[PDB]
Each structure stands twice: as C-alpha cells, then as structure tokens.
Amino acid sequence: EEFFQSLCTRAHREDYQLVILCDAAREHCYIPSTFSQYKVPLVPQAPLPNIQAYLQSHYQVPKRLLSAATVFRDGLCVGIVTSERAGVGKSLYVNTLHTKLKAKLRDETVPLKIIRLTEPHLDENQVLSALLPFLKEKYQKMPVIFHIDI
Amino acid sequence: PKEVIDMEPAMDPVEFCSEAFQRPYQYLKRFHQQQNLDTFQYEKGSVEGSPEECLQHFLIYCGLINPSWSELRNFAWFLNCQLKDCEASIFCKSAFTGDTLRGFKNFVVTFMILMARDFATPT
Numbered sequence: 001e002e003f004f005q006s007l008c009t010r011a012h013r014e015d016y017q018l019v020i021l022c023d024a025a026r027e028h029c030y031i032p033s034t035f036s037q038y039k040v041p042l043v044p045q046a047p048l049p050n051i052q053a054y055l056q057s058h059y060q061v062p063k064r065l066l067s068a069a070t071v072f073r074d075g076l077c078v079g080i081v082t083s084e085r086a087g088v089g090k091s092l093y094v095n096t097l098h099t100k101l102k103a104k105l106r107d108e109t110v111p112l113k114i115i116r117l118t119e120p121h122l123d124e125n126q127v128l129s130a131l132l133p134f135l136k137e138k139y140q141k142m143p144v145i146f147h148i149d150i
Numbered sequence: 151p152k153e154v155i156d157m158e159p160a161m162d163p164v165e166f167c168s169e170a171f172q173r174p175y176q177y178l179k180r181f182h183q184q185q186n187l188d189t190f191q192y193e194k195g196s197v198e199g200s201p202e203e204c205l206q207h208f209l210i211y212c213g214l215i216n217p218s219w220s221e222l223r224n225f226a227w228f229l230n231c232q233l234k235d236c237e238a239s240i241f242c243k244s245a246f247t248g249d250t251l252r253g254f255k256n257f258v259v260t261f262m263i264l265m266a267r268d269f270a271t272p273t
C-alpha cells in the first residue's frame with residue numbers, strides 16, 4: 001500500500017489499468033479493506049464455452065512449426081487427461097500419443113518426460129527443478145512430450 | 151469399460167494383439183459357446199476377434215459389476231499365467247496321448263474364475 005502511494009506521489013503514467021481481485025468472504029483483512037473506495041460492483045464474468053474457445057484459439061499451434069502437438073487434437077499444445085474414478089485409461093492414453101509421435105516424424109528418439117507430483121501443498125520449485133536441466137540445452141528443442149502427473 | 155460399451159473402440163489394440171489378452175480370449179471365445187476344447191490353441195497369432203467381443207467376454211466373466219480397466223487387466227493376466235502353466239505342463243500332452251482326460255480345461259477355467267474372484271475382486 002505505501003509503495004503504491006509512493007509511486008502515485010512520484011511520477012506515473014495516468015492511463016494505467018490496475019485491477020485487483022480478492023475473495024469476497026475474506027474481507028476483514030487489510031488490502032480489500034484499505035482499497036474499499038475503489039470498489040467495482042459488477043464482477044465481470046464471461047460464459048463457459050467462450051472461455052473454452054478463447055483458450056483453445058490461443059492453444060492452437062499453427063502448421064509447419066514442427067510441434068509435438070500434431071498428435072494431440074490437431075495441434076493444441078496442452079491437454080488434460082482426467083477421469084472421475086482412478087485407474088482407467090490415462091497414462092496408457094499418454095503412451096499412445098507418445099508412440100504416435102514415434103510413428104509420424106520418423107527416426108523418433110523423442111523424450112517422454114514424466115513428472116510425478118505426489119506431495120500435498122504443491123511446490124512449484126519441484127517442477128521447475130525437474131524442468132531446468134531439460135530445455136536449457138537447445139538440442140531438445142526437437143518435439144518433447146511432458147507428462148505432469150498430479 | 152462399462153460406460154464406453156453402451157455409449158461408444160475403447161481398449162488399446164496393442165493390448166489386443168498382445169499375447170496376454172489374446173490367449174485368455176482364445177480360450178474364453180471357445181468356452182462361451184460349448185465347443186470341444188480337444189484341439190490345441192495359441193498358435194502364436196491373433197485369431198479373428200474384435201476388441202468389442204473380447205471386451206464383452208472380459209466384462210461378463212470377471213464377475214464384478216462395474217470394473218475399472220486395471221481389474222480386467224489383472225483378471226486377464228492371471229488367466230494368462232494360469233493357462234500358460236496349463237500349456238507348459240504335460241497334462242494336455244497326456245490328454246493328447248491318453249484320450250481319456252478331456253473336459254478338464256472347463257474345470258480349469260471355471261476354477262480360475264473362482265480363485266480370481268478371490269484375488270482380483272473386492273466388492
């Protein structure tokens with residue numbers, strides 16, 4: 001708060017778009033209380049298939065790019081393989097996309113990195129430490145599938 | 151598999167061409183209808199079956215109502231090890247040389263259904 005006050009005292013662009021989002025049922029704390037005069041009472045929401053089409057339109061990898069996404073649903077670069085009850089088809093499905101990436105784009109040697117996340121209160125430093133020795137190499141910019149397993 | 155057999159194949163075909171699904175299906179296909187089991191099976195290749203039909207046999211002979219795929223995989227691999235032990239032993243050979251031993255493999259596959267109900271079936 002005092003740093004935002006310092007920046008609005010010193011010098012700043014007066015066309016700035018600062019948006020804050022807080023949990024509404026946790027209002028007795030500091031920051032949503034001391035910014036309460038700038039309360040916007042509309043809470044902007046888009047519908048569900050619009051959000052799906054927006055994310056899928058940006059996840060759509062274009063052609064002639066040499067992506068691993070071409071064995072997923074025509075180049076979508078991100079998938080989530082979920083199920084209601086556990087132990088049905090998920091990791092074998094990921095393995096079938098990996099062997100399909102072995103079939104197309106011949107002389108495969110393609111990595112299937114598996115990242116098993118098994119600890120409560122998820123730690124992003126684990127995933128970062130598993131990914132740092134991998135694509136900081138420039139010879140693995142050939143298409144790799146990564147399989148994060150929460 | 152029960153929820154994609156009424157709505158939607160579903161089983162991975164690299165498992166269908168595997169030995170471990172094909173040998174139990176090559177016995178259960180001849181076992182469903184009451185054919186004679188005297189002639190030799192598993193000639194190391196896939197017979198004319200479908201993923202739908204072998205999925206249907208595994209759903210109807212595993213015992214439990216709504217299985218996951220892990221349980222059908224365990225049921226089929228258990229039957230694989232037992233029928234492989236039946237093919238490695240000389241009781242089928244002594245059945246071929248004696249000609250009064252036959253009909254014992256119906257007993258064999260039925261009693262593995264009971265033991266498999268003990269091992270690979272809660273609820």
Ligand SMILES: Nc1ncnc2c1ncn2[C@@H]1O[C@H](COP(=O)(O)OP(=O)(O)OP(=O)(O)O)[C@@H](O)[C@H]1O
Pocket residue numbers: 083085086087088089090091092093160161162165219220223
């Ligand atoms: N469609 C299928 N047909 C035949 N076997 C299958 C099929 N899907 C999975 N299996 C078998 O089930 C076992 C485990 O499958 P898999 O690893 O894909 O499950 P999962 O959904 O990822 O499991 P979990 O939720 O426990 O992590 C393997 O032996 C695999 O061969």
Ligand SMILES: [Mg+2]
Pocket residue numbers: 090091
């Ligand atoms: Mg899995």
